[PDB]
Design a protein around this ligand. Structure first.
Ligand code: FAD
Length: 449
């Protein structure tokens, strides 16, 4: 497949924000010709199932089919659309009423804003009328791993893509002990997925991290501690307050030394320690990056320059209500991709509809969030006992709401085992009231007493 020399809409990166923008552009302009350039070999696909539902499939071919059952048992593909949705890049200029093409296996390596042109890694050049940068993020590594040898590096997984799901799933069936470094939602999701697999055979899964509990940077202490206990009960050796000093090999085994003196022996490492946005194109492009939040600096309309927009993980945007931010979540990529697509077809609209976040630690435990969520912000938590419907599966102390406050106004919300109430949370954040009583506000989420 060969890119044309010119395309009206060029989308750089072939993930969630690009796919959503393509969909939005085609809705706004049913004859649009849209080219997605994607460095990966696969068509656009969603990432969340890679750490969740693909692990809970009992079909041993799931690795090949990439089809998963949602918690409620409905089956679907990780791909946003099948191959029949797309047209070829070479045919894109000619097909009547246009289409969406994906040039896979190609990376955009230079952006020339003045001449509305990009160059690919193979030396082809493509001129565009409107461009979206949707390049996503790259995993941080741990310095202790960077200092270790090549064997350690080759037995350390940075969990991002289909290839990683496949490689780690295989490892899971081969080794006796896997260690996850990182206490965030992704680390914790992998801990639960791996712990579930380990269970039949009682093999070992370790999760270690510097905080006092799982998701300690986002959740307050009570709930972070509650979450750690839940992960432990999934059959995981959880080691909080753990700072890695070094990692080496010995007797074929990986040896992890912690600052506090503890040592861990394991067969494979998964490092889930957060991300950096992929801003390589900003230097050739002369595009500003945000030194406070990372990412391309764009405005409330996701716009960087006259015919360049940025969406998804890579976009540091101005939120008129909540302030400048960069958000790295699936629904944000959907919302911002869609918005950029509308703005690329004349919309001129600001980011307004607040995107949400979720995480499931199996069919039985679910979190959703929206707005400014950071455990350093003042929080107020209101909780209750869970009913049988308060879990991710049935949706399609055991529950509660956490309010995140700034200038005594709710700027963020976390819902713990409370589903189908995101719109209420969104409306509370939108209205920016000073609430006399957050226990009264908790009643909007069916949390009483
Ligand atoms: C395992 C996993 C589980 C997750 N679970 C959740 C969840 O439960 N809930 C949630 O809210 N969020 C979740 N996320 C986060 C969510 O997937 C991301 O926020 C989302 O993928 C961001 O979309 P994006 O378009 O910005 O980037 P991506 O979807 O990452 O797409 C960027 C694509 O562009 C490619 N690319 C980069 N640079 C170039 C270039 N120069 N040329 C060509 N191609 C390029 C990249 O290789 C990549 O394929 C998860 C992420 C992972 C990895």
């Amino acid at each position: 497949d060969k890119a044309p020399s010119h395309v009206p809409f060029l989308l750089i990166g072939g993930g969630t924000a690009a796919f959503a923008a393509a969909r939005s552009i085609r809705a706004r302009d049913p004859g649009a010709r849209v080219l997605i350039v994607s460095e990966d070999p696969e068509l656009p696909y969603m990432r969340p199932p890679l750490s969740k539902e693909l692990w809970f499939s009992d079909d041993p071919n799931v690795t090949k089919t990439l089809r998963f059952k949602q918690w409620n048992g409905k089956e679907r593909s990780i791909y946003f659309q099948p191959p029949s949705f797309y047209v070829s890049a070479q045919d894109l200029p000619h097909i009547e009423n246009g289409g969406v093409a994906v040039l896979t296996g190609k990376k955009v390596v230079q952006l020339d804003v003045r001449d509305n042109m990009v160059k690919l890694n193979d030396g082809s050049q493509i001129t565009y009328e409107k461009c979206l940068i949707a390049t996503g993020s790259t995993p941080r590594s741990l310095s202790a791993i960077d200092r270790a040898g090549a064997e350690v590096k080759s037995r350390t997984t940075l969990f991002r893509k289909i290839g990683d799901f496949r490689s780690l799933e295989k490892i899971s069936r081969e080794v006796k002990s896997i260690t996850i470094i990182g206490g965030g939602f992704l680390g914790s999701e992998l801990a639960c997925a791996l712990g579930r697999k380990a269970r039949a055979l009682g093999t070992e899964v370790i999760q270690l991290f510097p905080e006092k509990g799982n998701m300690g940077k986002i959740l307050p202490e009570y709930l972070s501690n509650w979450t750690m206990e839940k992960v432990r009960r999934e059959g995981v050796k959880v080691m909080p307050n753990a700072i890695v000093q070094s990692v080496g090999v010995s007797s074929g085994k990986l040896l992890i030394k912690l600052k506090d003196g503890r040592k861990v022996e394991t067969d494979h490492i998964v490092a889930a320690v957060g991300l950096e946005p992929n801003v390589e194109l900003a230097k050739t492009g002369g595009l500003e990056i945000d030194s406070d939040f990372g990412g391309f600096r764009v405005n409330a309309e996701l716009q960087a320059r006259s015919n360049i927009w940025v969406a998804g993980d890579a976009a540091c945007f101005y939120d008129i209500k909540l302030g400048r931010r960069r958000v790295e979540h699936h629904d944000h990529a959907v919302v911002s991709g869609r918005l950029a697509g509308e703005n690329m077809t004349g919309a001129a609209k600001p980011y307004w509809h607040q995107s949400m976040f979720w995480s499931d630690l199996g069919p039985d435990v679910g979190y959703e969030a929206i707005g400014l969520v950071d455990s350093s912000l003042p929080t107020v938590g209101v909780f209750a006992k869970a009913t049988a419907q308060d879990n991710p599966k049935s949706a399609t102390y055991g529950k509660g709401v956490i309010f995140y406050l700034r200038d005594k106004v709710v700027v963020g919300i976390v819902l713990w085992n409370i589903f189908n109430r995101m719109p209420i949370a969104r409306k509370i954040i939108k209205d920016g009231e000073q609430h006399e009583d957050l226990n009264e506000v908790a009643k909007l989420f069916n949390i009483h007493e």
